[PDB]
């Protein structure tokens, strides 16, 4: 029954993007794309070896083809500071604005850490990173919405499953996206808890380092180990 779930996770982790596309798909859909991104969510039995959101502003209402898939996954998986540097290292005055040739050079150096109808949007001209980082933040906000916008909206209530997006890998939606905004600038939320170390001990860290509602659904599962899986979740 679940051998295909674990097999699909195996594909989602140790397989080539070629394969992660040929299984989870002929461009995929916003509903499809999140399947490759989200572990432990199966595609249908008629899925296999080819068997206003950000996405619309890549093709034409849902189109996500190999090129778009490759480059679009490397934006949810890369942190903020990692992008600017590659931008500032290939611009030709070193302020963060890149053009088609330079932004061609940036993706080569950014994708290599691992083991198209949108060239018109970003640029001909040149694109800065103050705006690019907005493209990334929008990609995330939209993909996160869709991921937790079907799980059971009934508008969230879910409780018991919400933990499961926390363990995707490893009361509303606005409370959730704020748990993921707190959750992402987390390194300092490790050093704050590690100073406080060496459960409203952190509810102020959410407002002093991350800057009570969801605080209850988390402490009932396990801090200081919380952090490990949360970090290794993006």
């Amino acid at each position: 029954d679940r051998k295909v779930m674990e097999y699909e996770n195996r594909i989602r982790a140790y397989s080539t993007p070629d394969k992660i596309f040929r299984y989870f798909a002929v461009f995929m859909t916003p509903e499809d794309f999140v399947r490759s991104i989200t572990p432990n969510e199966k595609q249908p039995e008629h899925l296999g070896l080819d068997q206003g959101s950000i996405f619309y502003t890549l093709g034409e209402c849902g189109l996500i083809s190999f090129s778009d898939y490759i480059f679009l996954t490397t934006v949810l998986s890369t942190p903020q500071r990692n992008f600017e540097i590659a931008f500032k290292m290939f611009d030709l005055n070193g302020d963060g604005e890149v053009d088609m040739e330079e932004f061609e050079q940036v993706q080569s150096i950014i994708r290599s850490q691992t083991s198209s109808a949108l060239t018109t949007y970003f640029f001909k001209g040149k694109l800065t990173i103050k705006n690019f980082l907005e493209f990334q933040r929008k990609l995330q906000h939209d993909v996160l919405k869709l991921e937790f916008e079907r799980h059971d909206p009934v508008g969230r209530i879910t409780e018991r499953q919400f933990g499961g997006m926390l363990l995707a890998y490893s009361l509303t939606f606005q409370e959730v996206e704020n748990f993921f905004t707190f959750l992402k600038n987390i390194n300092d939320v490790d050093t704050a808890l590690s100073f406080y170390h060496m459960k409203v001990t952190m509810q102020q860290v959410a407002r002093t380092v991350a800057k009570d509602h969801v605080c209850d659904v988390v402490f009932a599962l396990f801090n200081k180990e919380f952090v490990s899986i949360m970090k290794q979740r993006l």
């Binding site: 500032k88 290292m89 850490q113 050093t191 704050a192 100073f195 060496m198």
Partner: protein, 289 residues
């Protein structure tokens, strides 16, 4: 962590060090002295106030203090953490220790902020931050202006000590300074290039040495800027180095410094920089032992 090496004052088994001793602790790996540890007198604790009253708030505080001061072992570790750990992980304890309003830490929480990082009587640091009796609060702004002033101090006196008292240090002198703590396998190669492959002389200034030191103390970004090229094998040439220093720190670097860095770490590279080598040396420079 055996700061006992330099501590000259003792009281009921607790050892304290004067600002002079703390400075010897960073410029001298050892010296010909036996420290003549003496019992803490009723004048030393008074000389602490005396010192902070006549000392200056700038780059010269620890030097103007001379012997008129007191530093406790935990505060010694605190100061070494200031010198050794980067300028990114101290603003996380102030906001966390002053949640009422903005970041001002009371005298009673300074001991906490010390028992966090690298973990009886009042010392120069207490009296300077929270006043002669504790009535003042430590704003994060004043503490940043303090942290970087201590850094500037060690930079200036290392400048003079490696320049042997001349106004300008030689490029060979800057080479001596950069390699002062590197004891690794390629210790010889680095010193070969200094002597066989380096245009001698040419007047490195104190401002330029301060530029390189600030670059070393803001190198977290230079790593991943450089850890791009290592992955997706791609070289790092003189222009790449210039631009990478620019993005990491936002400042030009005089051509003497750049020529020195390349001529030392162009290990069989032919104008290409062995940069993991260079970062290794730079991290040997940060923690002195």
């Amino acid at each position: 962590q055996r700061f006992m090496q330099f501590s000259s004052l003792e009281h009921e088994g607790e050892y304290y060090m004067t600002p002079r001793d703390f400075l010897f602790s960073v410029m001298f790996e050892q010296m010909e002295r036996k420290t003549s540890v003496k019992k803490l007198t009723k004048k030393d604790i008074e000389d602490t106030l005396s010192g902070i009253q006549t000392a200056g708030c700038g780059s010269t505080f620890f030097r103007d203090l001379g012997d008129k001061g007191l530093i406790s072992y935990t505060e010694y570790l605190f100061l070494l953490t200031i010198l050794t750990k980067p300028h990114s992980g101290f603003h996380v304890a102030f906001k966390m220790l002053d949640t009422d309003g903005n970041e001002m830490i009371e005298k009673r929480e300074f001991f906490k902020l010390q028992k966090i990082i690298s973990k009886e009587i009042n010392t120069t640091l207490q009296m300077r931050f929270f006043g002669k009796r504790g009535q003042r609060k430590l704003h994060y702004k004043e503490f940043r202006r303090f942290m970087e002033n201590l850094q500037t101090e060690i930079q200036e006196m290392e400048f003079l000590q490696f320049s042997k008292g001349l106004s300008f240090m030689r490029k060979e002198d800057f080479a001596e300074w950069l390699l002062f703590f590197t004891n690794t396998e390629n210790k010889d190669i680095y010193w070969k290039n200094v002597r066989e492959k380096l245009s001698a002389g040419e007047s490195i200034s104190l401002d330029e040495f301060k530029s390189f030191c600030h670059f070393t103390t803001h190198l977290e970004d230079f790593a991943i800027a450089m850890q791009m090229f290592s992955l997706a094998h791609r070289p790092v040439r003189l222009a790449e180095f210039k631009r990478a220093v620019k993005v990491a720190t936002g400042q030009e670097l005089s051509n003497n410094i750049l020529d020195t860095v390349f001529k030392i770490f162009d290990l069989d590279g032919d104008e290409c920089l062995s940069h993991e080598e260079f970062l290794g040396v730079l991290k040997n420079r940060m923690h002195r032992g």
